[PDB]
Amino acid sequence: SHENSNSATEGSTINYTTINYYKDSYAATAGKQSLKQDPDKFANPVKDIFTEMAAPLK
C-alpha cells in the first residue's frame, strides 16, 4: 500500500505488522510489536560493570 507515513511509531527500533484500509497509517491496527528487551538500562546502569562471581566492591 502506498500511503502516508503519519504513524506515532514511524521510525521505531521495533517493526510492526499491521492492517489498514486508509491512506493515513495511524488509522492502522496495533498489530504485533517486536519482542526486544533491555533491562540493564534500568536494572544495571553502572559505568564499570561487575561480574556475578566477584565481589561488587573490591
- Answer yes or no whether residue 2 interacts with a second copy by CB under 8 A: yes
Q: Min. distance of Cβ 2 from other proteins in angstroms?
A: 14
Dihedral angle computed from the Cα positions of residues 29, 32, 34 and 39, in that order, rounded to the nearest 10 degrees: 100
Return the residues of window 21-40 that contact a second copy according to CB under 8 A. Answer: 23, 29, 31-32
Contact of 36 with 13, CB cutoff 8 Å: yes
Tell me the HSE value of 36 on the side-chain side, using a 13 A CA sphere.
8
Nearer to a second copy by C-beta: 2 or 47? Answer: 2
Q: Min. distance of Cβ 57 from a second copy in angstroms?
A: 45
